[PDB]
Amino acid sequence: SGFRKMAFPSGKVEGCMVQVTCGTTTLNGLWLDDVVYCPRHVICTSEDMLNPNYEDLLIRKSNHNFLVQAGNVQLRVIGHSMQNCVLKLKVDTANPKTPKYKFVRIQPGQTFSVLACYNGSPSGVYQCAMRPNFTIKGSFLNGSCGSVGFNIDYDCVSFCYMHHMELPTGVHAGTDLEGNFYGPFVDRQTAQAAGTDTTITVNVLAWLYAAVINGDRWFLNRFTTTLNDFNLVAMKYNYEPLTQDHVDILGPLSAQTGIAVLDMCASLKELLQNGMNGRTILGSALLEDEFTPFDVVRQCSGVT
């Protein structure tokens, strides 16, 4: 037993990380088959970053403008193109450590593992949720751009995130591996802020189930409720609307614990009014919203 925030094992991704340099800028790249993926902002000087014309700045560059290093070994760049906000560097060598992989775009509320990297060197791994406001609450310093987020399904890595920038509030923004931003953000030095965030309701409920399953039961009660009554409380507390699809995805946990969702909503309802004033559920004084139902079942069943 026990319940921890757990990343996927990062080894299939560690084998793909490289250093990419263009002028004075070094950041990370993702080496899959014979292509290196990195943020297009690698091409920009500080002056360019204010109002970049990526079309123009890139035709001006050539293959030899890009240094790619896999450990101590230089990769030869034999071509370059841009897809949305991602740069694709064609290299002369297929990565012999390329895993079974897909590029996937994740939905807000879904979780993934971040492999934080510096100078092409894996530094740490942690779990994030894609927030409703399309930011992530990561831990990133200068040099971390090009660090990726992923899930693992059996032996298949699903790459879903590439790190691009920090916003003024200290939260993080990036693209999918096709270079489409999550959220209404641009890759330039201009005024940009995160939207007011909201709490991921179905994940909070998942985590209350995780708590019950681990012998934390104090918050529970005899009552129940309606989607309609709860949602009016949720909107008041800046929680996402709970939908029939959400209630359905929590099915296994309602079953395993004997506590129905609108049962737990009643518990959750009661918790929103009052505050848990330093009091604790699974070692937290906050209502945790970065575990998905799948995260709770996966962890409380030992999937490998």
Q: Which residues bind ligand TJV (CB under 6 A)?
A: 41, 44, 49, 52, 145, 165, 187-189
Q: Is 53 helix (H, G, I), strand (E, B) or coil?
A: coil
Judged by CB under 5 A, does residue 212 bind Na ion? no
Whole-angstrom distance, CA of residue 8 vs CA of residue 75: 28
State how far the Cα of 270 lies from the Cα of 276, in Å rounded to an integer. Answer: 10
Pull the structure tokens for residue 300: 């409380």
**Both tokens assigned to 65:** 């403008």
Chain residue at closest Cβ approach to Na ion: 263
The residue with its CB nearest to ligand TJV is 41
Q: Cα separation of 281 and 219, whole Å?
A: 8
List, in sequence order, every residue forming a beta bridge with 161; answer none if it has no partner: 149
- Residue 221 contact partner, candidates Cl ion, ligand TJV, Na ion, none, CB within 5 to 8 A by sort of partner: Na ion
Residue 119 touches which member of its own copies, ligand TJV, Cl ion, none, C-beta under 5-8 Å by kind? its own copies
Per partner kind, with CB cut-offs from 5 to 8 A, the member of ligand TJV, Cl ion, Na ion, none near residue 266 is Na ion
Choose the one of its own copies, ligand TJV, Na ion, none that binds residue 44, judging by a C-beta under 5 to 8 angstroms depending on kind: ligand TJV
Stated as kind and residue range, the H or E segment containing 102 is strand 101-103
Binding mask 258-297 for Na ion (x = CB under 5 A): -----x--x-------------------------------
Tell me which DSSP letter residue 237 carries: T
Catalytic site residue from 41, 163, 164, 172 = 41
Residue 156 is a catalytic residue: no
Breaks in the chain after residues (C–N exceeding 2.5 Å): none
Distance CA 212, CA 235 (A): 25
41 is catalytic: yes
Q: Which does 110 bind (CB under 5 to 8 A by kind): its own copies, Na ion, Cl ion, none?
A: Cl ion
Cα(36)–Cα(231) distance, integer angstroms: 45
Please, what is the minimum distance in Å from the beta carbon of residue 272 to ligand TJV? 37
Q: What is the rounded end-to-end Cα distance, in angstroms, of the chain? A: 16
- Name the CA dihedral angle for 294, 129, 240, 225, rounded to a multiple of 10 degrees: 30
- Tell me the per-residue interface mask from 93 to 112 with Cl ion, x by CB under 5 A, - otherwise: -------------xx--x--
User: Among the options 16, 38, 85, 145, which is catalytic?
Assistant: 145
Q: Which residues bind its own copies (CB under 8 A)?
A: 1-12, 14-15, 115-119, 121-126, 137-144, 166, 170-172, 214-215, 275-278, 280, 283-286, 299-304
